[PDB]
Write a protein that binds this ligand. Structure first.
Ligand SMILES: COc1ccc(CCc2c3nc[nH]c3cc3c(=O)[nH]c(N)nc23)cc1
Ligand SMILES: COc1ccc(CCc2c3nc[nH]c3cc3c(=O)[nH]c(N)nc23)cc1
Ligand SMILES: [Zn+2]
Ligand SMILES: [Zn+2]
Lengths: 367, 367
């Protein structure tokens, strides 16, 4: 198995299906990457996450660097050993979280300083991800807040493109890392085509193992996001994986794949699960609603997950309303499993040339 | 398999080891019954509870009658089907909880009325346990608060003994129940020998499938409790199971078995697990303590549970301090498993006539 190898098995319009080979394993694409903030996919044992169908999971660098700390994790043997997941792990750069869930921050061309006191930069981010033993490393960037003027967006995109250069060199400076992990570049430019094209060209110029479409999923609404994806994805090299960061609602995923995205990550599955929202082919449902109190059917009539084979909506309804942890566990397992079944259906329909039809049938019933 | 059959395989001093056969399965004694308050053993899937080694679990009638309600559970098919546990389930009568975690109450010879508005009585308690599909039914009693005067204790014990008569008749009034479940009587009398003997005689007079020693584990301290058990257990018919309610610390269990107890239930395993306390052959340890931050060893060097085979103290230390649900799950699984391994060691040493020695070695290292 190679450090990184992406091969496309089939295509239908802009949609693609294939595999990414890495030392720790094979990732089937389009892929959904379950997220874990504090070295854990909330309420799920790694084996359970895997049984759900995930080939790779997302790691939270921001929280991990604060606790238990990057150096610490490295001393304990690395994230894989620490949380018990021997398959590929992708880690975000940490910039996004800083400008979001942080008290006060200090921006500068060198990087960022945040109290929530820490100084995160392209070089530091890359080193933290290395200490964690990350398989897919995200370049350190700046996520332009939405909305943004052409000037502010260009200015930001320009800094990200410079930070991407530093991420690239920093990554190549570590033999072990450059040799066993992969580096993904992040495209910026807000919702401006000319800027997205410039970001795309600069990134390609530097050269990365994969390209992420950043700056979206920041409150622009599906229409706007899809509009941006329409002209943005094509600008990325076609022979490399396309990763849409933070996008996860089922309908967003289907839409994004129709536009060329190969990878996804989203907190909804887990978060919604604990909030009481379960996903089904008939749309999301809030299990706490009184209508489910005596409903003996499983969360979803078709779901293959263990939860739907064993427990009823009524029981889960009870657990969640009772604040029981098991409730959180079952809802999360089903939700994650649902997302993976969505991905499997996506991959199969594309390999069979019936994806466009699948997308239609999906929406019709889902909505 | 019979409705109820208790046979003793071996004895060593007052300690006994054997089995209780019931339609839903075999219960190895001495036995530890994991507790679940709201139709769930907190943070554990039923299969996980079983993998831990439990032959039977405890059901919370008090919470269940309030939510989702006894009638409701019965309509959904019964507690077994509802929570996914097809093995024996024992349910307490509900009286203990009322006089404890309830706002205001109204006592009377008929039963009790509590707002937390409900009227629970011997007859109602028995019917609720029936609707839940309970395998081992506890008679409805009054748990004399500690400390108590001889008069107040006798007065209370006398009411319990009357309520036990009503529980007995109520239970025998339901063909289905009397035919498929078992009824356990509860001994009272506070810490008074003459009262414990009277309660014991009255209970035996009525006749039950098993006898519980109630009134203890109410803040009397181990010395006092053991003192009471010394003269109380022998008064119970020797050919029936002896159940010490609410007792669970490892040392209490070993001590109680040395005095003739066959069954146990306790919230500590699960509760302590979420609080950060893990049990080991070297005594409890609070995993949150800084000393465990980089400890790669498992919770216990000997524990056979899945948690100790897969994760480190350091990782669990992280999860709990991070408020992660997985932390609660792993700690609980290990704790429950530890208790079951304790019981297995108890049963094996007794079958082999080396229990007294085991008890010594256990304490020496545990403390
Ligand atoms: C806690 O675990 C994680 C949670 C979320 C993420 C993705 C974060 C994220 C975005 N999310 C929405 N839009 C985004 C956009 C971006 C973006 O443009 N750049 C980066 N680096 N990240 C983005 C990574 C890990
Ligand atoms: C939530 O699930 C459960 C939790 C605890 C219990 C046992 C409750 C209990 C006692 N506990 C300590 N001393 C006790 C003493 C008693 C007692 O004397 N009688 C009864 N009926 N119960 C007692 C049953 C179910
Ligand atoms: Zn399901
Ligand atoms: Zn263990």
């Amino acid at each position: 198995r190679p450090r990184f190898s992406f091969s496309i098995a089939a295509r239908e319009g802009k949609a693609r299906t294939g595999t990414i080979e890495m030392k720790r394993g094979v990732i089937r694409t389009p892929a959904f990457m379950p997220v874990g903030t504090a070295a854990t996919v909330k309420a799920l044992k790694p084996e359970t996450v895997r049984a759900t169908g995930a080939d790779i999971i997302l790691g939270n660098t921001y929280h991990l660097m604060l606790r238990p700390g990057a150096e610490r994790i490295a001393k304990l043997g690395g994230l894989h050993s620490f949380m018990g997941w021997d398959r590929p792990i992708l880690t975000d750069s940490g910039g996004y979280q800083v400008m979001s869930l942080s008290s006060l921050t200090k921006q500068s061309e060198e990087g960022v300083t945040f109290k929530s006191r820490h100084m995160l930069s392209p070089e530091r981010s890359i080193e933290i991800q290395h200490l964690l033993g990350s398989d897919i490393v995200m370049a350190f960037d700046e996520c332009t807040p939405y909305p943004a003027t052409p000037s502010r967006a260009a200015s930001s995109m320009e800094r990200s493109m410079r930070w991407a250069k530093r991420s690239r060199d920093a990554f190549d400076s570590r033999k072990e890392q450059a040799e066993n992990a992969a580096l993904f570049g992040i495209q910026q430019g807000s919702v401006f085509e000319n800027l997205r094209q410039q970001s795309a060209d600069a990134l390609a110029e530097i050269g990365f193992d994969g390209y992420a479409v950043g700056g979206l999923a920041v409150g622009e609404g599906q229409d706007e996001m899809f509009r941006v994806l329409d002209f943005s994805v094509p600008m990325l090299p076609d022979d490399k994986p396309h990763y849409l960061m933070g996008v996860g609602k089922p309908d967003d995923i289907v839409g994004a794949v129709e536009r060329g995205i190969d990878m996804f990550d989203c907190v909804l599955p887990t978060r919604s699960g604990r909030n009481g929202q379960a996903f089904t082919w008939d749309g999301p449902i809030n299990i706490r609603n009184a209508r489910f109190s005596e409903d003996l059917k499983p969360l979803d009539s078709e779901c293959h997950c263990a939860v739907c084979q064993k427990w009823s909506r009524a029981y889960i309804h009870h657990l969640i309303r009772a604040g029981e942890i098991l409730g959180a566990m079952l809802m999360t397992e089903h939700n994650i499993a649902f997302y993976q079944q969505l991905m499997q259906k996506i991959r199969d329909s594309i390999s069979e040339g019936r994806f466009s039809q699948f997308a239609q049938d999906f929406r019709a019933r889902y909505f």
